[PDB]
Amino acid sequence: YTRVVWCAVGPEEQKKCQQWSQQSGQNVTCATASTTDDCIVLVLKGEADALNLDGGYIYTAGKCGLVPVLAENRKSSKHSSLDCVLRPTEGYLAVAVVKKANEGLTWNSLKDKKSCHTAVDRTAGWNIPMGLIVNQTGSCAFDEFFSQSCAPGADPKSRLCALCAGDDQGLDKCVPNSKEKYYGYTGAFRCLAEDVGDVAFVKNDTVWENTNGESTADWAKNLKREDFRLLCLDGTRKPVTEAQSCHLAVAPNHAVVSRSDRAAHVEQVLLHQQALFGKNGKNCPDKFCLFKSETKNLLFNDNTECLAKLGGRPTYEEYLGTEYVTAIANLKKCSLEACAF
């Protein structure tokens, strides 16, 4: 066997990867980059093998020839008896979240408010909400819609980064990695929870995992679900229990990608790695758990039950679905058939 070189995005992922490398006995090793885009370039050069990507990034990687290998699979209810690895993925719900106390803020009065985004180019944090906003406003000036934002990956001197905080020292403001205080699902929800923004564009799971004591993190300790509302497209506000009827879209699960010529090798290694360090793995929680990182979703989402085989050997377009692909295509017209690298 050859080793698999995993690509870690930023210093916190690098630390988790190093631990996994040690525990795997160097069956997995680590390369590190500052952004997801740079990790994708590493994979293309053949300097790294794989990383787990949000749907929006799978689109970028796909244009450049990378293929989906295995998908994150979280808890379900349907397909009960079927093993996690073979169970179809269900997809997550992209939602827009506000404080209950911010009364009369609805989908239709979002203009000139403050926004919290997981990162530019990501499914729930960006592509879905901004795609809808462009369509509804007939304008590609989505950078003038919100008064101020935190959208990791945008220009640090623009309004889109105005609310981003950087790291401990206030360095790396708006970098699309976990060094940025408000990056990712948990970061964007924190941006709302601390009332830096009026709205966060996250997924349904984020609200549940960071309220009612599900998170012992300082800022999330006292957060109650009832203090939050979801914004529906029909102009209403619902309790966070109603996400099935009040979401902006269903997103395809985050998935491991690699170069096509390395796909089968990456697959084999990962299946074995999860038997050891996965949810009921030999060595988890005794030595190391691949799918834990204390609420920080490092390398993988913390709610990941397993990585699932795909079936139908999907291309990246099949994986993302024709609905989502055309949504992205239409939005990319603002800022068509190539590879950004």
Ligand X SMILES: *[C@@H]1O[C@H](CO)[C@@H](O[C@@H]2O[C@H](CO)[C@@H](O[C@H]3O[C@H](CO[C@@H]4O[C@H](CO)[C@@H](O)[C@H](O)[C@@H]4O)[C@@H](O[C@@H]4O[C@H](CO)[C@@H](O)[C@H](O)[C@@H]4O)[C@H](O)[C@@H]3O)[C@H](O)[C@H]2NC(C)=O)[C@H](O)[C@H]1NC(C)=O
Ligand Y SMILES: *[C@@H]1O[C@H](CO)[C@@H](O[C@@H]2O[C@H](CO)[C@@H](O[C@@H]3O[C@H](CO)[C@@H](O[C@@H]4O[C@H](CO)[C@@H](O[C@@H]5O[C@H](CO)[C@@H](O[C@@H]6O[C@H](CO)[C@@H](O)[C@H](O)[C@@H]6O)[C@H](O)[C@@H]5O)[C@H](O)[C@@H]4O)[C@H](O)[C@@H]3O)[C@H](O)[C@H]2NC(C)=O)[C@H](O)[C@H]1NC(C)=O
Ligand Z SMILES: *[C@@H]1O[C@H](CO)[C@@H](O[C@@H]2O[C@H](CO)[C@@H](O)[C@H](O)[C@H]2NC(C)=O)[C@H](O)[C@H]1NC(C)=O
Show contacts with Fe ion in window 21-60 (CB under 5 A). Answer: 54
Bond into 285 cis (ω within 30): yes
Of residues 251 and 270, the one with the C-beta less far from ligand Z: 270
Task: Name which position in 73, 115, 123, 210 contacts Fe ion (CB under 5 A).
Answer: 123
Q: Does 163 bind ligand Y (CB under 6 A)?
A: no
Q: Does 305 bind ligand Y (CB under 6 A)?
A: no
Distances in Å between the alpha carbon of 31 and those of 207, 257, 275?
32, 15, 23
Task: Name which position in 9, 110, 132, 165 contacts ligand X (CB under 6 A).
Answer: 132
* 3-state SS class at 29: strand
Q: Does 93 bind ligand X (CB under 6 A)?
A: no
Size of the site for Fe ion (CB under 5 A): 2
Q: Are 237 and 101 in contact (CB under 8 A)?
A: no
92 is in an annotated binding site: yes
Q: Does 1 bind ligand Z (CB under 6 A)?
A: yes
In the complex, the smallest distance separating the C-beta of residue 123 from ligand Y, rounded to whole angstroms, is 15
Q: Are 253 and 89 in contact (CB under 8 A)?
A: yes
- What mask, x for binding ligand Z by CB under 6 A, covers residues 14 to 53? ----------xx-x--------------------------
Show contacts with ligand Y in window 170-209 (CB under 6 A). Answer: 204-205, 208
Note the residue count of the chain: 341
> CB neighbours (10 Å) of residue 100?
14
Q: What is the 3-state secondary structure (H, E, C) of 144-163?
A: CCCCEEECCCCCCCCHHHCC
Q: Which of 56, 99, 127 has the alpha carbon at shortest distance from 191?
A: 99
User: Which one of ligand Y, Fe ion, ligand INS, none is in contact with 77 (Cβ closer than 5 to 8 A by kind)?
Assistant: ligand Y
> Token digits for 44?
């293309």
> Which parts of this chain interact with ligand INS (CB under 6 A)?
37, 60, 121, 310-312, 314, 318, 321, 335, 340
Q: Does 286 bind ligand Z (CB under 6 A)?
A: no
What DSSP element (H or E) covers 230? strand 228-231
Cα–Cα distance measured from residue 96 to residue 305, given in angstroms and rounded to the nearest whole number: 25
DSSP 220: T
118 is in an annotated binding site: yes
For binding to Fe ion (CB under 5 A), which residues are involved? 54, 123
For binding to ligand X (CB under 6 A), which residues are involved? 131-132, 135, 322-323, 326-327, 330
